[PDB]
Structures are given as C-alpha cells and as structure tokens.
DNA sequence: TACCCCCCCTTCGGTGCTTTGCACCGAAGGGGGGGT
C-alpha cells in the first residue's frame, strides 16, 4: 500500500526511443529466464507496439561471478528524467570517502524492487528481448517497480534507505557510506579483517529489513588512500640528439598550454641551425636553468582548477602500447583535476578491447568516489570496433557516456 | 474477438481531410465490388453523415493473381499518429535454422482484415469511394480492422499475432514456429502423423481467433517456398535470380542490376560490384544511358560464372563450431564464407565498404570480421572461429603499434593468396647516418598559389611552385619532394599535424592522388623517420624552410 | 499517388579538428529482398 512518487521527464522533451542491439543466445537465454521471474513477481509487464518508447537492455556477469545479472542501458532515459536535484531527493557526496583506507562496494538493486512506480511514468522504462535469428517479433516489457540503473530509483528509495542504515551508522559513526545507482560505497578506516567484519554486519542488517519490511552477498574492495597520481614528466638525458631536443621542445610547447610559465627559447636556440637529428649537440649553461626550472614549475600544481559541482566530468585515454593506458580527467580543456595511468590490466597485451573496457571502469569507480559523478569518456577506438565487443567485458551496473576519437601522437606526451 | 490495440493520435492534430483523386474506370468497377464485399463479411462500417474525413483510395494487383487488394493512402493520418515501436527487428534467414524431420509452411489469409482496429480509431479511416466515376455521390465507409496503408496496421497485427501464438508454443514446447507477418514457419521432429495433428491444432487455434489459413497458402511438400528461398529437407537455396541481360543500360538498370547481386552473395560465394557501382557514382538521372566499362564488364562476366552454376547452404547443428573464412579480393572488397563442415557453406557474404579517405587493407580487414561478428550474433548467437589470410606476426606488429585500440577474436592464420600485410614500417628512432630533410609547404589562401620545398643538414635545398592548391595539399607534397629525392633511408621533419596524422596510420590505399604517389614512395624505402616539431618556433631548418615557401 | 522491417552503394550536409580545408558520419534516396 505505499505511494507511488511522481516523476516527470524535462519540459520539452521526449522519451527514450534506442534501439535494442543483438544479443548472444547465453545472453538471451539469461534475460528471457530473468524476465520470466521478474514477471510472475509483478516487477515487469507485457506490453504492446503502441508504447512508442524503448531502451537498450543486455546482461552481464560481475567480477568473479558466474551468475548473470540483467542490465539495462538507461542513459538515455537518465538524461531525460528530471533531475532530483531540483526536487531536493539528490544524494549529498561526502569528502571522506576517498580519504578512507578501504571502501566496499555493495550491490542493493535488488531492494529497489519493493517500491512502485508512477503509473504515468511506467511507459518510459519499456523494453524489448530480442530472439535468436528473429524466431519470433521483440517481447516487450515495462517496469512496475524502481528498476535496477535508473537515476530516480535511488533518489525515491533514499528515504527508505537512510532509515534502514540508520542503526549501523549510529553504531558505527566513523563509517562513511555513499549511495550511487545501485551500489552502496562503504569505507572506513579500520584494519581489513575488522572492514570486512562492519561489511558482513551491514549485509545481515540488510536482510534483517529484507526478511521484514547481481546478489547482495558479492563486494569488491577499493583502496582511495593508495590511489596515485600520474604527472607530466620530462625525461633526464646527460647527452641530448636534435631529435631528443625536438621532443623535448614540442613536448614543453604542448605543456604550456596548461603551465603558462613554462618557456622554450633558450632550448629553442640550440635548434638553430639545420642538422641531422642524430648529431649529440651540448646544452647551453642558459638552457640547463631553462630545464631545470621547467621541470620545478611541472612539479607545482596547476593555478586555478578546481571542481565545479555544476559543470560535467571529462576523461580522455590514450593507449601508449604494452598493456599502459593513461588518462586525464578535466571539467575545462587544460585544468586537469586528475591525471593517471593504467598497466597490467585484465587482457593486457592480447586484448586492447577489453583493457580499455577496463579503463573506463576503473576511472569511472575513482569519479563516482571522488566527486560522485561518472565522466564523459573519450575514447581512442573505432565506433565499430567499440560497439561489437564492449558488452563482452562489462562487469559493472553503470554505463557512462562516452565518444570516439582518432588523436594521432605526435607528442609522447603523457608517457616516455 | 481479438482484444483491441488503443491507439490515438499525435497530441493537438485531427484527422485527415484529403479528398479523393479521380479514379480510371477500371478501376472503379472492381473497387466498388471489393467494397461489398469487406461490407458483407463487416470488415468496414457503412456510416459516413457524421464524419468529416477521408482518405484517397487506389487499387493494384495482388501477386501472381487476378485478385485486387485496395490501397488506402494513409500519409497523411500517418503523420497525424501516434508513433509505433516496430516490433519487427530483423529477418530471419535460413542458415539459422535446424534441420527437422517434419516442416510445414502456412499463410495466414486475410491478415489485417482479421484483426479488428481500435474503436475510437475507427472513425478516422473514414474514406469515401466514388459509386459509378462522380455520376452518384457514392458511400463512405470507415475500416473496422488494421487497414492497408495505415502506419500501425504491420505494428499491430504482428504484435496481435504474437500474443495469439503465445499459449500455443508454451503447451507444445517441442515444435518450433517462425513468425514473419501472417507468414509461418512449423518444424518438428515429429512423426509426420503427430505434426499433422500438430498443425491441424494449430489452425483450429489461429481460426479460433478468426485468423483462417488458407489451404491454397498451405505448403505440405517440399520445397517450400519462404522468405523468398526454397527449404529442401538438407538443404537450402533462393529462389531463382533473374539477371536483365539488356544491351543498353540506364542508371536505374545498373541499381537494379547492382541490388540483385547484393542479394546473391548470400549465398553465391565471390560476387563483386565495385566496378558497377562505380559506374552508377555521379549526378546520372535515372534515365540516362551508361556504357559499360571495360573491367566493369569483366566483374559482371566473373558474377554470371558465379551463378551459372547452382549454390545450396546448409542447417545449423548447434553442437558444432561456426567458422568464417575471408578472403581478399582486391580494390577493398572481401568475401566470406559461414560454415560448419568444409565445402558446406551455411552462408557467404561480401564486404566492400570503403569508408575513410585513407586506409588499408588491415583496417578493412578488421571491419570485415566485426560485419561477420554482428551479423553471426543476429543468426546464431554467437561468434564464429576465423580464418584470415594474414599472418600472426603482421597483425602483432599492427595492433600493437596502432594508436587506437583494436582487436580480432580467436582466429588463425589461413595461407590463400592474397595475403594481408602491412606495406612498410615507419622507425622509431632517428636513423644515423640518413640524410635530414625539414619540409614545409604554404598556399596563399586567396591566391591558390603555393610552394613546396625541403633543406637537408647537408645543405640539399628546393622549392616547387604550385598551383590550384591548399596548405594541406603543400605540406604533403613538401614530404614527397623529400622522399622522392632522398636515399633508401631518410630521416624527415615537417610541423604538419595533417600529413603526419595521414601516413602514421599506414595506409595502403587512398582516395587522394597525391596520398597514393607517397604510399609508392614509401614502400620503395628501407627505413624512414617522421618527426614533428611545432611550427614559428625557431626550430632546426623548419624555420629556414618556413622561410623558402612563404 | 499506400504501410512496416532488414541489407548495400552513393550523395550530401552537419560537425569538429587536420581549420576556413579536410575528414568523418549519419541521414536519405536509389536499388535488392520479405510481408500487408
Ligand atoms: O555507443 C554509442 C551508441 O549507443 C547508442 C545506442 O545504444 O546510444 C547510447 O549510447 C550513447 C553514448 O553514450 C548515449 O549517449 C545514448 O544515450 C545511449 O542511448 C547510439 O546512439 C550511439 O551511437
Ligand atoms: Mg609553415
């Protein structure tokens, strides 16, 4: 007999109408059985050609998980729902999540499944399985209850979610605990054995609710604390080629951009004449200062960035060969908020598809901990060669945006 | 009855009001008796005081038939509809089908007239026939069933028939039932007593709704005739292809001619159409007549070689593996073939897409793979083994090496001539002892005037005059200069941001002339560098040879 | 003088860095095919 919260779409715009993509028969099979569940318990219903709505649905297994779990790609229901915001349901970001020494991430979709929906909003959330060489027309279904990976289902949960954590945060107030989508980030700063202990405590806490009023027994553990940073740096040579000295001045050239102090003359100067590129050629006593300040101003952090809750996370990867993958996370061109790199990575030096799934993953965890919010990816693939593969190496319950680009490296610019 | 689909139309418009054009005598004779007709069976309602709208109306000849199927012009109500989400996400194709004892093939007859519309719809179907050619005032009627015309009518019959169908695979869950429109598909390995039992169940069902099968559309010997191919017990192929041999060809007998070998190489393994597709790039209208060029007549001889002989494909036996084998066939096209068993090929395809100014074989080849990737998803699944004519070591050092991530499932190597390879290596590092060459190039903007020239350390200058050009196309020419003039080994520095972008990638074909001539050059090296250093800088001779050609 | 789906090949205009040229991409219109 509860209530259903009223949700709205932005003035003037329509709902999401994406269309579904193949599916591989284990992933059909996974979402016609999940489906059939989710129907007999009333979370989902049949629906007919006059919904003109759709959005994309698949399924994927978790990191070290051998059972499927449903997912569907709501970014495009997400950015056309109403943000909450506005309506005063979004969650605040705590400063001290990324400051603890372990965080747990829990997945509690599966509780938002107690709630119903806005009967008005239902047609929105409508989509189709497809079947295995078009055997049969797409079976369509919309959600009834708060589905798994849309935005308004934690903000209208939010209420029946602090009251439920109430009990073990007043126990244990030196926890932090963030909520984002369908996952619940807990971190403290306790020795692991006694972390893990807080965390199987919150999980029976948990089914304490559930038991009264994709499973929630999985959790992966982050380290914020020992999360480095990747800076801008300019090789050490005793004896410098025309080439070295080339990249080193189109590579202090680039970085000027976002060090304006940064200068190239006197180094410039010992390119004058033309020679090959080869040829050992003395740095100047002028241009040894010139170095050797540049490499002090790299080291001072950039003047004047800061994050803006208001303006969107971009992350730019740059693929530099031998399973290394480095990136840049920016709200303004040039005032990097983080820099990193990647190596060693799941499918390192057979698999570029899936180190770079990988990537994006793992830099939109560091987001949602740092500032709460996943970026904009741009990413250094084919649009085609993306979109065959990605879903094949997708472990987690969120989809940021992103886009392609072809950025030919000129400058060895993050990576020496 | 069939319950109804609500229907409405796009917030704030009204219905249509489009008057009928006038109607050839012929034709108004046999609309008016079609029209009786839908009136006795109550597929459409007499009233029309009340009503304001109405719709055009034609009439065109079934297929292969004396009977006439009467068309309502609906684009209009179209417009003013609600929009649909089709249903209807791909077709399916025989090479995803198993292979089963028993088969049959029926139709359902009359399929939209068995589904009855949306009441409050109804009223705006409205459409008015003239009785004798505007000598009476004639009748108007409004449709009681998903119209032909209509926007929602496919939308809402396939869905209908989804539901109907529904129950009926659930309680037999041995048989298998492909749904395309009214079109069905029965398999079962079933004695062929209890699958025409089984059949027999299912038109008492499908009349239970009043949707009739029609004996005259019920196939019970094979071959049957489906989706437009011909299903034998072990095998399958197309119904025949009809090839125009006309001497004269306009454009649109080229795209005729050009979509029909598009729809063979299904099956027929090696069709090409680049050289006929070309011939049809250009402003051509349709009626223009186009001389066949001489190697495009070639590609038309190999195709008719290709269809002399007759082509089956086989069923899927999913306990087996799928495997894809490519091979090159030049100028960016490939051809594929889909099978399970040598020399049994479930299907074959070609790809000949050619996106990007500049690019190479590498590149094509790995878009080819995802083609047969996705398109393999869609018939079966899953992904198929490939068989690739390019070696371990020439995809290591591309994949590796390129910028972009990219990648090819399980596969190995296959040694057909042509194989894939990568055309040349650029260095890593500046080559010692090679001779420096610093390039640039300008235009004059408006002028289109430009020059292009090198200086080398050991004081080798020149400068080309240009004409009719662009920045770009002078700082690719500036790298020519310099590899046309240079030893097997050249180190070179140039600040275009263009050109280097163009030749890292390593491209072995191009849309550009000049980009081609480079390639060549290319190729003919041993070992060259590119480097790139910012331009006005004050850099080595790029601030000489900046000079040279402004 | 009609409707819905899929496919390939070409053209064309919008978009963003390679910048005021050039490259890429998606839409749309030609054809093939299926069914009403
Ligand atoms: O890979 C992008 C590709 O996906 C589509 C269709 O699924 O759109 C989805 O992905 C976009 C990229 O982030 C989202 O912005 C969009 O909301 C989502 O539906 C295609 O539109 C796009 O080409
Ligand atoms: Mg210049």
């Not at chain 1, 800076?231 to 060090?259: C, H, M, R």
């Not at chain 2, 190999?302 to 089956?312: Q, W």
Request: net charge neutral; hydrophobic share 35%.
């Amino acid at each position: 007999p509860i209530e259903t919260v009223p949700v709205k779409l932005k003035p003037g715009m329509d709902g999401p109408k994406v269309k579904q993509w193949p599916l591989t028969e284990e992933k059909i099979k996974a979402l016609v059985e999940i489906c059939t569940e989710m129907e007999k318990e009333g979370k989902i219903s049949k629906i007919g050609p006059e919904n003109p709505y759709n959005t994309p649905v698949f399924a994927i297994k978790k990191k070290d998980s051998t059972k499927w779990r449903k997912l569907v790609d709501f970014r495009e229901l997400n950015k056309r729902t109403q943000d909450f915001w506005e309506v005063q349901l979004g969650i605040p970001h705590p400063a001290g999540l990324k400051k603890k020494k372990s965080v747990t991430v829990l997945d509690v979709g599966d509780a938002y499944f107690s709630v119903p929906l806005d009967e008005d909003f239902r047609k929105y959330t409508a989509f189709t399985i497809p079947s295995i060489n078009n055997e049969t027309p797409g079976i369509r279904y919309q959600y009834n209850v708060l589905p798994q990976g849309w935005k308004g289902s934690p903000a209208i949960f939010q209420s029946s979610m602090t009251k439920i954590l109430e009990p073990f945060k007043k126990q244990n107030p030196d926890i932090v605990i963030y909520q984002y989508m369908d996952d619940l980030y807990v971190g403290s700063d306790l020795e692991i054995g006694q972390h893990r202990t807080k965390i199987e405590e919150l999980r029976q806490h948990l089914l304490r609710w559930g038991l009264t009023t994709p499973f929630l027994w999985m959790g992966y553990e982050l380290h914020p604390d020992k999360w480095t940073v990747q800076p801008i740096v300019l090789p050490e040579k005793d004896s410098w080629t025309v080439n070295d000295i080339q990249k080193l001045v189109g590579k202090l050239n680039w970085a000027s951009q976002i060090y304006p102090g940064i200068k190239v003359r006197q180094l410039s100067k010992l390119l004058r004449g033309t020679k090959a590129l080869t040829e050992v050629i003395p740095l100047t006593e002028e241009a040894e200062l010139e170095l050797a300040e540049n490499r002090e101003i790299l080291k001072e952090p950039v003047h004047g960035v800061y994050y803006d809750p208001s303006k969107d996370l971009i992350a730019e990867i740059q693929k530099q060969g031998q399973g290394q993958w480095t990136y840049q996370i920016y709200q303004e061109p040039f005032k990097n908020l983080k820099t990193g790199k990647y190596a060693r990575m799941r499918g390192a030096h057979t698999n570029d598809v899936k180190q770079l799934t990988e990537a994006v993953q793992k830099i939109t965890t560091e987001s949602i901990v740092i500032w709460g919010k996943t970026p904009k990816f741009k990413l250094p693939i084919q649009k085609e060669t993306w979109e065959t593969w990605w879903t094949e190496y997708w472990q987690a319950t969120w989809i940021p945006e992103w886009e392609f680009v072809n950025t030919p490296p000129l400058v060895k610019l993050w990576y020496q | 009855p069939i319950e109804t689909v609500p229907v409405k139309l796009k917030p704030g418009m009204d219905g249509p009001k489009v008057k009928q054009w006038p109607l050839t005598e012929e034709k108004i004779k046999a609309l008016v008796e079609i029209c009786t007709e839908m009136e006795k069976e109550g597929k459409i309602s007499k009233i029309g005081p009340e009503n304001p709208y109405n719709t055009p109306v034609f009439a065109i000849k079934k297929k292969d038939s004396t009977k006439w199927r009467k068309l309502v012009d609906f684009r209009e109500l179209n417009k003013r509809t609600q929009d649909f989400w089709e249903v209807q996400l791909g077709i399916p194709h025989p090479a995803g089908l198993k292979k089963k004892k028993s088969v049959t093939v029926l139709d359902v007859g009359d399929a939209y007239f068995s589904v009855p519309l949306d009441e409050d719809f109804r009223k705006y179907t409205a459409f008015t026939i003239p009785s004798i050619n505007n000598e009476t005032p004639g009748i108007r009627y409004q449709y009681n069933v998903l119209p032909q015309g209509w926007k929602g009518s496919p939308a809402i019959f396939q869905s209908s028939m989804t539901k109907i169908l529904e129950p009926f695979k659930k309680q037999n869950p041995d048989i298998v039932i492909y749904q395309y429109m009214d079109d069905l598909y029965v398999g079962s390995d079933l004695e062929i007593g209890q699958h025409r039992t089984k059949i027999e169940e299912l038109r008492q069902h499908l009349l239970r709704w009043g949707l009739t099968t029609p004996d005259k559309k019920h196939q019970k010997e094979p071959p049957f005739l489906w989706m437009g191919y011909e299903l034998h017990p072990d095998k399958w192929t197309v119904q025949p292809i009809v090839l125009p041999e006309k001497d004269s060809w306009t454009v649109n007998d080229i795209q005729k001619l050009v979509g029909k070998l598009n729809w063979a190489s299904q099956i027929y393994p090696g069709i090409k159409v680049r050289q006929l597709s070309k011939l049809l790039r250009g402003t051509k209208a349709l009626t223009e007549v186009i001389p066949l060029t001489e190697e495009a007549e070639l590609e038309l001889a190999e195709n008719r070689e290709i269809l002399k002989e007759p082509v089956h494909g086989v069923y899927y036996d999913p306990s087996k593996d799928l495997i894809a084998e490519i091979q090159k066939q030049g100028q960016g096209q490939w051809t594929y073939q889909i099978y399970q068993e040598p020399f049994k090929n479930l299907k074959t395809g070609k790809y000949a897409r050619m996106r990007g100014a500049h690019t190479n074989d590498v590149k094509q080849l790995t878009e080819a793979v995802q083609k047969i990737t996705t398109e393999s998803i869609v018939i079966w699944g899953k992904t198929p083994k490939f068989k690739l004519p390019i070696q371990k070591e020439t995809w290591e050092t591309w994949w590796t090496e390129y910028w972009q991530a990219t990648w090819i499932p399980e596969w190995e190597f296959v040694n057909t001539p042509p194989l894939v390879k990568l055309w040349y290596q650029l260095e890593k590092e500046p080559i010692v002892g090679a001779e420096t060459f610093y390039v640039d190039g300008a235009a004059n903007r408006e002028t289109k005037l430009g020059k292009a020239g090198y200086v080398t350390n050991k004081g080798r200058q020149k400068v080309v005059p240009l004409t009719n050009t662009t920045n770009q196309k002078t700082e690719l020419q500036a790298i020519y200069l310099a590899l046309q003039d240079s030893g097997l080994e050249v180190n070179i520095v140039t600040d275009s941001q263009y050109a280097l972008g163009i030749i890292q990638a390593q491209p072995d074909k191009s849309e550009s002339e000049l980009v081609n001539q480079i390639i060549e050059q290319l190729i003919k090296k041993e070992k060259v560098y590119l480097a790139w250093v910012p331009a006005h800088k004050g850099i080595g001779g790029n601030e000489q040879v900046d000079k040279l050609v402004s």
